[model samples]
Target: TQAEKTATDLPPGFSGKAGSVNATPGTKGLDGPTPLADGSFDATIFGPAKELKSADDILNVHRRNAKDPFAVGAVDAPLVITEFSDFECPFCARWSNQTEPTLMEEYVSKGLVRIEWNDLPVNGEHALAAAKAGRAAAAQGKFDEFRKALFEASRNVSGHPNNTLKDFERFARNAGVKDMERFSREAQDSTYDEVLAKAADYAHGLGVSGTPAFVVGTQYISGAQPTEEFIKVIESELKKSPTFSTPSSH
Candidate 1:
């Protein structure tokens, strides 16, 4: 059922390679048929092609606003990847800590891709608390560092521990938030509730039911997939962009 579900949900050409992305099997991804260079899986792996969501529909999720605090990279980058992730998900940390570095170094630094953050705090109260704290940190330009610390902190522990206001305060301090007074005050601000609600609703509307889902251009990548998968999608999408340079293959 998982294989069938994955097959149906994935973009028209991309193959999951791995099956269901479970935390226990380590960070490799779901075990399934590897994709070809063109990003297509074996036809026998999933059977007939089904109607899938259009790429433009998913690509429309990119905010593309230059002032969006939750975004990184050039706003006009040809490829925009909206990350719908949960703070409590270990796989999200894996992607953040592992795959993201490569993407940042190659794609993000090259001004080819923009990463847009969307908080899909499906893990419960602790996740919601983390999201709120993240927004507070964003106000002070510490959003990225705070989240990095949060994910790293989770790596050294057994589960999502930064649930309380005090816990978030500690993390905020570690993230280099100079304005501790303001950070604490803003972290508890209730205005973030509506923002979080809308983010979760948007993710659900995109048919995302898990953590660390990504919408790259029109291609939707669910779960914390490997860096190569991301690269595959990015390159594929980049080639299709009108502004993308068409290099001679000869």
Candidate 2:
């Protein structure tokens, strides 16, 4: 299958054996917006058809403020990709490992893109618990670390053994979170549930039902697509951004 073919010959931290929840691995059901060789894809596969003609319409779905702990990249970047994902989803882990790094390097460091995270948690309580742990990690300014650890631990495995609250403690420690007591309290507390609920509502309103969905500027992408696909979309959007300036201008 194409998915199996695409999953092959990948870098580290990505497991070709990773399967969907209760579904077979390497099947078309687990695939997302299939990209052509030139990195073009049918964008309609992501969200319901809607015309996002203005910056306001696009930014309305951004849903995160400047200095948001659960995000990375410059706040003023010309492009913002609000990533809606579940921690327990294998494809998301694949994207986190295989695609996200290139975006961080080629665009994020260049002040061309900002990536924000919103929890979808489609796998229910297990995913929600991990989301809470992620929030706790963000409180200590270790979200990036925690996310890497979570995805790393989740890779090449099945049954999502790593999303439990017990596992979050180890993940926190691995992320260099110093305050174990605080992490424990916060990870177990309901302090972040409101934000998660709001995020979920917003995601649903935007027609996101998948584990990994993204709003890249006004365009939407669903699934763990290749890095080139992201670059293609980002470059096209960059050309249209009125607020964008060359990184060297700074």
Candidate 3:
């Protein structure tokens, strides 16, 4: 894990070197450095794959458009952080539980930062179903609620496979999803898979083979990092955003 290497080089079981590479129950799983769309470097750390080998080239190669129906905040917000996550990823859980709340309170509520969620279900079995469930929740206008509630429930449910959809009905209700019938039906339907597949593809294109990857302006964060790090990236990006000309306080 160096500045020159990528996430792909880390290998499945990443640090542990134990159990199945991608299985949910036993091992770390093998999500390679989500190579950039142009397919550059491995995602060894929390930065972009170094295709052109220059910071300028990497940033220019991966400029994200700031918009999504499942996102919070206004489109014109001074900063946009696009998040990539797997429903069953432990690190994703940690990020949701530890970092997201503070980010929402400080940046999203202040109209300075907008966050968009993109699904990358690489955790096997349960993740795909949960991601689809999220899509269904969004269709019913309860995505954010369902997402938080589902993650909370998953945390309580522990272990692999069992957490996939066992309590989706209960969690959906708790999430205040009015149309449980549609939620169930749509979650199983094939119609929404298009978006999910596209998201996974997008992650791979960016050499981002894991959960909790974030795109802030030109900077790419590959894991759930400290809130202060987020602020640092945001402050720097906001300063550089040509579209962000208005004055605002940190």
Candidate 4:
């Protein structure tokens, strides 16, 4: 006395056009049932719904972790500003000469913000060479001095004049680099090349496609925008911190 199972053993709602279904030979898992030739059976089951969450969660998980070329501002300071620039670039030179003093007066000198430099040369061969020269200067603990001298020389020789190397040497001498031979030798070495390469790699990773780009905390501002634009961005970033306040007032 044994029980037998047959095709007719299926539940009522599970057999016809509105019934449950399973995966077929060439199709994916039980999406739905297809109609039979004679319309004898058709079965269907709804697909699962997708889950949703706050879009802000995605931003929080993948926040930017950028590095600055210089030191950060004070612990209580509001923001860190980083500049990606090239010495030979005219606009960068323009910013250095025209707007930088204002920025220093308003933000940097007072310690309201910390500014860092990144070498992002785009003049091909000359760009890499200049970056190496700057790094070599950095090795001697005179990076800022060398940077100013080089930028001044670049401004003087704008429009691609000849004798650029002579001008560079003169600037180096004027900057009090006593060991000219040693400095030149070091500047030409592969070590400086490696440093410049690392700077370029950093710039590339940060989506800096060109010179004169700036990062004010998490926000990026491109090109040589006016000083007020920078002030606006910096002020907005500072407002986020509870203890942040204007340095000029202090």
Model 3 residue 222 lDDT?
84
> Candidate 4's error at 170, in angstroms?
2.5
Each prediction's number of clashing residue pairs:
5, 0, 21, 1
**Candidate 1 local lDDT, 126-186, one digit each (tens):** 8888888888877766667788887877775545564688878888989898888877876
Note each model's CA RMSD in angstroms. 15.0, 14.5, 15.4, 28.0
Candidate 4 has a TM-score of 0.63
> Which stretch of 10 consecutive residues in model 2 shows the poorest summed lDDT?
20-29
lDDT of 4 by residue, 1-94 (tens): 3877544533432333111112111111111122245522111111111121433322121111111112223322345566788877877877
Question: On residues 157-184, what C-alpha lDDT tens digit does candidate 3 reach at each position?
Answer: 3444345554666677887878778788
Prediction 1 global C-alpha lDDT? 0.67
For candidate 2, lDDT tens digit of each residue in 48-70?
A: 12334554676666533443566
> Model 2 segments beyond 4 Å from truth?
1-56, 245-250
Worst 10 residues of 4 by lDDT: 41-50
Comparing 1 and 3 on TM-score, the stronger one: 1
List per-prediction Cα lDDT, in the order shown: 0.67, 0.68, 0.61, 0.54
Provide TM-scores for the models. 0.72, 0.72, 0.68, 0.63
**lDDT at position 248, candidate 3:** 52
Lowest summed lDDT across 10 adjacent residues in model 3 is found at: 23-32
After TM-score superposition, what is the CA distance of residue 226 in candidate 4 from its true location, in Å? 0.9
TM-score of 1: 0.72
